[PDB]
From a paper:
The metazoan transcription elongation complex (EC) of RNA polymerase II (RNAPII) generally stalls between the transcription start site and the first (+1) nucleosome. NELF is a large, metazoan-specific protein complex consisting of four subunits, [name], [name], [name], and [name]. It binds both RNAPII and the nascent RNA transcript emerging from RNAPII and inhibits transcription. DSIF, a conserved heterodimer complex of Suppressor of Ty 4 (SPT4) and [name], is required for NELF recruitment and RNAPII pausing and also serves as a processivity factor upon the pause release by NELF dissociation. In the present study, we determined the cryo-EM structures of mammalian ECs containing RNAPII, NELF, DSIF, and/or TFIIS stalled on a nucleosomal DNA.
To gain structural insights into RNAPII stalling, we performed cryo-EM analyses of the EC species stalled during transcription on the nucleosomal DNA template in the presence of NELF and DSIF, but without TFIIS. The major classes contained RNAPII with its catalytic site translocated either 1 or 3 bp downstream from the initial position, and we built models for the 3-bp translocated complexes (AEC1-nuc and [name]-nuc). In contrast, [name]-nuc revealed a different NELF binding mode (mode 2). In mode 2, the NELF-AC lobe is farther away from the secondary channel, exposing the TFIIS-binding site. Furthermore, the NELF-BE lobe in mode 2 is reoriented toward the downstream DNA, forming extensive contacts with the RNAPII RPB5 subunit. This change causes a ~35-Å shift of the N-terminal α helix of [name] (α1), the only resolved part of the [name] subunit, which forms direct contacts between the α1 helix and the downstream DNA backbone. The [name]-nuc structure revealed the direct contact of the N-terminal α1 helix of [name] with the downstream DNA. In [name]-nuc, RNAPII does not reach the downstream nucleosome, but the NELF-BE lobe is close to the nucleosome. In AEC1-nuc and [name]-nuc (left and middle), RNAPII is backtracked with the RNA 3′ end extruding into the RNAPII secondary channel. Thus, the NELF-binding mode 2 is involved in RNAPII pausing/stalling, where the downstream DNA contacts by the [name] basic helix play a critical role.
Numbering used by the authors:
A (entry chain H): 2 to 150
B (entry chain A): 914 to 1058
C (entry chain U): 1 to 132
D (entry chain V): 1 to 194
E (entry chain A): 578 to 673
F (entry chain W): 40 to 582
Write the structure that this text describes.
């Protein structure tokens, strides 16, 4: 499998500081079940979104269901089954920072995973239970798909 | 107070030791009195170096020029050896202290065993040794790096 | 999503909702209500203590609208089964919540052989009439 | 160790033994002595069963209560030495001293007597004379009591001073006859202040 | 960095190949607000400032003369200190 | 019996063994063993101490010297409490109570005090399994001290008693007015909101009573106080309140408001949704969005300095606020009849102008005064005036504002006077802001500017008194004078101006609150001056 995290998000806000870049838009989203905050940079030119939209976000370690753990090089001539066939927006990046409310005595209840998709940043802030597949300096796929419900 | 809380590495609290060190090491650093004495001597030498620094550097200018960028080397080691700074590590603090002490022997500017030569060598690398001991502390190697 | 048996379901409910100090139903109840547990409550509701019933009924409202939409019939069943408990608290709460899955609102009926409600409503209404 | 208790009415071990010697049933008399004559508080009587239950006898907390009341008395009188009207409170301390001069002979309450004597600026002369008669009472007395004692005791004052004079002579003759034959260190070398 | 609906790379992704070896460097852009480091979004810059390079990969930030120029601690300086001089020469040529 | 006699003799050798609690048992065992008691007597001769009698003797010594006997008894009892906690064992207590089988009178003495009852409560909590603790609890309940037993959580678990307590508390609240509601609110709210079930039932009955349009405002205020208290405790039930109302016909609005109140922030998406639906031909119930928490968050967003809001949705925000505040609806039997939207264009323009003035912190106060005509024109609406006072509240809440404030009698206080004049309901908020300013003791400015600011605040609160808001202002002055946190010159000038502006006759409450004000020597020895018009002498003579 390799599904590090899966949930349903709705776009609660678009970039509040203004459009710093024309093609890239900042999104502040909330969860539905686990109630965790999300900040994401998206290529708004090719995948336009607006306020009030909902989408399924499935962070996955690999696109292959059998979990063969590909190296991470571009090989378009690959006929193996992939998760991207059932998702509209796919990004590939690496997680570079993990925060938390860690104390010197007891553990952390909230975590914050920072991932960079080659420049486009995403921060997933939530309770520590739902964020366990995130280990710093590891590759991650985004795999979000809009919902019509 | 901040200096003491950042460079003491107290061996009294057990929960913090479990959080930062493996179980095979926390019992060793909790039961052995020799290790605690070594740690206290290390902190005292750090305090003496702090006094020396405050004497040499008035106006509180903490920017200095030194040969080796210790923080960048620590970062490089962290990225090379895949530290994962979230789980307790396997590094006895006495290993850090002994390593720093033996490293200070090798970095020589004045070569010789004469007391005059010894004093000159100690003076030549004084600032770098102070910086190295303030960077490779027992607590920092277990709580920050 | 395993089928948790009646004694096992009661043990699970009295362990997760057994915090008497937590008279407030924790937000975790939103994730503590699934299809299997609600389905299996049909037999373990007899052995639940009154505090457990009150906590579960108060947490039943802290659910997503889509979850309520997809889990209607089981929740109607649990409401009708809660309407047959010794504590009138559960009876009244289930009676009002029977309309929650249908329209999203809470029913409003009082003074129906409820002496404390009768006294409270009468005295507060007459006092408000005195100090209108 | 328990002399002088009989004067104030608090029976000591001597009379306790003399009574239990010719009593067939010590239990009832002991109970009435510890309850009526002792702490006449229903709270302590209700506490007694619990302290029996723990296995720690009534001995330990009775001793702790006695010691803490002794400490509270001494600390309270220490505060008293600097609060209230000076003359009236001094006379009250004198009254406490004349009451406790019967119990001065029992060491478990002797520190109370010595503390009161220390606090009082001028101890009555008869009490000072009786204290001077015993060595332990004299040594236990503070510097104020010693000052009050020495003002009228010529021979005692001279005898107390004499060992210090002998020590001064010994150290002077050790300095005059010292092997350090150096110019910088002689008999008169230290400054007068030193 | 993007696979669907069309495979598109990013300038930072391509520049990560130019950076030699495994170089770790942190700089700040010329137009970096000072108050940004105070509140939230410290590690996720809205203005794409705070250049960060880990393992010789440009994670985030916009490069200017503050990080590629003739200043102490610049990217070329870290390249010369960590790698040799031949590697730095290749770095210059590849960038150009 | 050699071992028994030897162990008994060794026990007797311990310092003061005679007052053992088993000395009866030990001596009975010794007598059974055949040991003659003369050795015991001889050993206890030197082995006795009056650790029970001379304690009392020192007690009367302290009493004679001047110490209170009550304090001595309290110290003795506290030491007994501590030594009993550190020397308690329950199981053997159960054994001895099974041996006895009767109700102990010494246990009655044990319970007779409050501290020892608290010790019993602690023991019962620590050792629930033990029998004597439950027996003591039931004895306490039978003796009439069941109230001292833990009842904060017991009240929640009881239906009818809690219902009667709620009924009596609310009846007393409505009897004594807001002054008594402020007193009865803490305990009643804590009892209701400590248990979630109690909170739900209480909110249900308050909502049911508030259904009546006649006098339901008080019931709705009670429900709002209860829900605010519940939210302040970390328990969120706003979605429950929305489900209580008529939000079924508008699920979108209910979901939006629930999310907004749950996360406690202002998001453009839900506000856009609400603007779209409310501006449409079928607006939802306006009363649903009239929750004080939402409006407080909205004022935090658009008035507090440092808060940034979307400029592209600012018009939608203003329209939502105007509809929630100024647009009126008629309801008969909970049925929507007509909608008055007159206060929608001018009101929204005023809101926009006031928000632009307040959130433009770079502009100086002089520029704001330069538009005083428009400021006064817009400040005449209740929501806008309250928002202005809130903006001033955060703006002056910064301690450095007084350093940047270069007027003895600034314009902010004039706006406060305008707020007090404009609306009567805003008087408590003006009073709270003035109390916050006056209680703010400054250690970073000269005392002279503090004195000027306090004199100006006294003028403002005199104005508050003049407009009918007398009782709280007079009570606050009385409290300040009896607390010595105000300069005597300030009090003298305040009272002089009060008696200068006001004229007889005076109500019973006013004279009852003001006679002790003159009773203080700090006013009698200062304001009383030789003149034809002496306010203190006049007020004394007229009463």
């Amino acid at each position: 499998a390799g599904i590090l995290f899966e949930d349903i998000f709705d776009v609660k806000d678009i970039d509040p500081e203004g459009k710093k870049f024309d093609r890239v838009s900042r999104l502040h989203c909330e969860s539905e079940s686990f109630k965790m905050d999300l900040i994401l940079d998206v290529n708004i030119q090719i995948y336009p979104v607006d306020l009030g939209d909902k989408f399924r976000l499935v962070i996955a370690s690999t696109l292959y269901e059998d979990g063969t753990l590909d190296d991470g090089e571009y090989n378009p001539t690959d006929d193996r089954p992939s998760r991207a066939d059932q998702f509209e927006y796919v990004m590939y990046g690496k997680v570079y920072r993990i925060e938390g409310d860690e104390t010197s005595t007891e553990a952390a209840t909230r975590l914050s995973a920072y991932v960079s998709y080659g420049g486009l940043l995403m921060r997933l802030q939530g309770d520590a239970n739902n964020l366990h597949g995130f280990e710093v300096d590891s590759r991650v796929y985004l795999l979000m798909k809009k919902l019509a419900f | 107070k901040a200096f003491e809380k950042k460079f003491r590495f107290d061996y009294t609290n057990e929960r913090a030791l479990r959080r930062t060190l493996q179980e095979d090491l926390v019992k060793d650093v909790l039961s052995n009195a020799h290790i605690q004495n070594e740690l206290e001597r290390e902190f005292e030498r750090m305090r003496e170096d702090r006094e020396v620094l405050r004497v040499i550097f008035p106006t509180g200018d903490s920017k200095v020029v030194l040969p080796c960028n210790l923080l960048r080397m620590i970062w490089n080691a962290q990225k090379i050896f895949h530290i994962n700074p979230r789980l307790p590590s396997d590094l006895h603090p006495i290993k850090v202290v002994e390593g720093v002490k033996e490293l200070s022997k090798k970095l020589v500017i004045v070569n010789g065993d004469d007391p005059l030569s010894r004093q000159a060598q100690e003076n030549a690398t004084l600032l770098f040794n102070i910086h190295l001991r303030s960077t490779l502390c027992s607590r920092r190697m277990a709580e920050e790096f | 999503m395993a089928s948790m048996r009646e004694s096992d379901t009661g043990l699970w409910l009295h362990n997760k909702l057994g915090a008497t100090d937590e008279l407030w139903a924790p937000p975790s109840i939103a994730s503590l209500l699934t299809a299997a547990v609600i389905d299996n409550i049909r037999l373990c509701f007899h052995g639940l203590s009154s505090a457990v019933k009150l906590k579960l009924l108060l947490g039943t409202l802290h659910l997503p609208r889509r979850t309520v939409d997809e889990m209607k019939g089981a929740l109607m069943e649990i409401i009708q089964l809660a309407s047959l408990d010794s504590d009138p608290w559960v009876l009244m709460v289930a009676d009002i919540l029977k309309s929650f899955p249908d329209t999203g609102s809470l029913n409003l009926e009082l003074e129906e052989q409820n002496p404390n409600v009768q006294d409270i409503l009468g005295e507060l209404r007459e006092k408000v009439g005195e100090c209108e | 160790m328990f002399a002088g208790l009989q004067d104030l009415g608090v029976a000591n071990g001597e009379d306790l033994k003399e009574t239990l010697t010719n009593c067939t049933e010590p239990l009832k008399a002991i109970e009435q002595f510890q309850t009526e004559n002792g702490v006449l508080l229903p709270s302590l009587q209700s506490a007694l069963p619990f302290l029996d239950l723990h296995g720690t006898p009534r001995l330990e907390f009775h001793q702790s209560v006695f010691d803490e009341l002794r400490d509270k008395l001494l600390e309270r009188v220490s505060a008293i030495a600097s609060e209230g009207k000076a003359e009236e409170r001094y006379k009250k301390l004198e009254d406490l001293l004349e009451k406790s001069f019967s119990l001065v002979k029992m060491p478990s309450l002797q520190p109370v007597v010595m503390c009161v004597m220390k606090h009082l600026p001028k101890v009555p002369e008869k009490k000072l004379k009786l204290v001077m008669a015993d060595k332990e009472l004299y040594r236990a007395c503070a510097v104020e009591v010693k000052r009050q004692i020495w003002q009228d005791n010529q021979a005692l004052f001279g005898d107390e001073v004499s060992p210090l004079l002998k020590q001064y002579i010994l150290e002077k003759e050790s300095a005059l006859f010292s092997t350090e034959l150096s110019v910088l260190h002689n008999f008169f070398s230290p400054s007068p202040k030193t | 960095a993007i696979l669907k609906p069309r495979p598109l790379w990013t300038g930072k992704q391509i520049f990560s190949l130019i950076i030699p070896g495994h170089i770790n460097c942190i700089r700040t852009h010329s137009t970096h607000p000072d108050d940004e480091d105070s509140g939230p979004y410290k590690h996720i810059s809205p203005g794409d400032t705070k250049v960060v390079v880990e393992n010789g990969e440009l994670i985030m930030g916009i490069l200017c003369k503050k990080s590629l120029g003739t200043s102490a601690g610049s990217l070329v300086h870290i390249s010369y200190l960590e790698m040799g001089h031949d590697i730095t020469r290749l770095f210059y040529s590849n960038i150009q | 019996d050699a071992e028994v006699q030897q162990e008994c003799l060794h026990k007797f050798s311990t310092r003061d063994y005679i007052m053992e609690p088993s000395i009866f048992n030990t001596l009975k065992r010794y007598f059974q063993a055949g040991g003659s008691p003369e050795n015991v007597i001889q050993l206890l001769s030197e082995n006795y101490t009056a650790v029970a009698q001379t304690v009392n003797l020192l007690a009367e010594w302290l009493i004679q010297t001047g110490v209170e006997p009550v304090q001595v008894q309290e110290t003795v009892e506290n030491h007994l409490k501590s030594l009993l906690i550190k020397h308690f064992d329950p199981r053997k207590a159960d054994s001895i109570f099974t041996e006895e089988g009767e109700t102990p009178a010494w246990l009655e003495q044990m319970i007779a005090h409050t501290t020892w009852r608290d010790l019993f409560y602690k023991l019962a909590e620590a050792h629930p399994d033990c029998l004597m603790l439950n027996f003591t609890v039931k004895l306490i309940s039978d003796a009439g001290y069941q109230g001292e037993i833990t009842s904060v959580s017991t009240a929640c678990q009881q239906l009818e008693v809690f219902s009667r307590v709620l009924r009596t508390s609310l009846a007393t609240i409505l009897d004594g007015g807001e002054e008594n509601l402020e007193k009865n609110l803490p305990e009643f709210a804590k009892m209701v909101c400590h248990g979630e079930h109690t909170y739900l039932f209480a909110q249900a009955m308050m909502s049911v009573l508030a259904q009546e349009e006649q006098g339901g405002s008080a019931v709705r205020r009670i429900a709002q106080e209860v829900q605010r208290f519940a939210q302040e405790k970390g328990h969120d039930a706003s979605q429950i309140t929305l489900a209580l109302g008529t939000a079924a016909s508008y699920p979108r609005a209910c979901q939006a408001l629930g999310a907004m109140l749950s996360k406690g922030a202002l998001n453009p998406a839900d506000i856009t949704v609400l603007f779209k639906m409310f501006t449409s031909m079928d607006p939802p119930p306006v009363e649903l969005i009239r929750v004080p928490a939402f409006l407080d968050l909205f004022m935090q967003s658009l008035f507090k300095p440092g808060a940034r809001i979307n400029q592209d949705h600012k018009h939608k925000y203003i329209h939502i606020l105007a509809y929630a505040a100024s647009v009126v609806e008629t309801w008969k039997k909970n049925k929507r009849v007509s909608i008055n939207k007159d206060e929608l264009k001018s009101t929204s323009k005023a809101v926009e102008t006031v928000h632009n003035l307040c959130c433009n912190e770079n502009k100086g106060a002089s520029e704001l005064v330069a538009e005083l005509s428009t400021l006064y024109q817009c400040i005449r609406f209740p929501v806008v005036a309250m928002g202005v006072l809130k903006w001033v509240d955060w703006t002056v809440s910064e301690p450095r504002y007084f350093q940047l404030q270069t007027d003895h009698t600034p314009v902010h206080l004039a706006l406060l006077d305008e707020i007090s004049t404009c609306h009567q309901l805003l008087h408590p908020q003006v009073l709270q802001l003035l109390v916050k300013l006056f209680e703010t003791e400054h250690s970073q400015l000269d005392v002279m500017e503090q004195l000027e600011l306090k004199k100006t605040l006294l003028d403002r609160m005199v104005h508050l008194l003049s407009r009918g808001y007398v009782l709280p202002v007079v009570s606050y002055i009385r409290k300040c004078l009896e607390k010595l946190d105000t300069d005597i010159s300030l009090i003298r000038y305040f009272v002089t101006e009060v008696l200068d502006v006001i004229a007889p006759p005076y109500t019973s409450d006013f004279v009852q609150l003001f006679l002790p004000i003159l009773e203080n020597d700090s006013i009698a020895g200062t304001i009383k001056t030789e003149g034809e018009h002496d306010p203190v002498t006049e007020f004394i003579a007229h009463c």
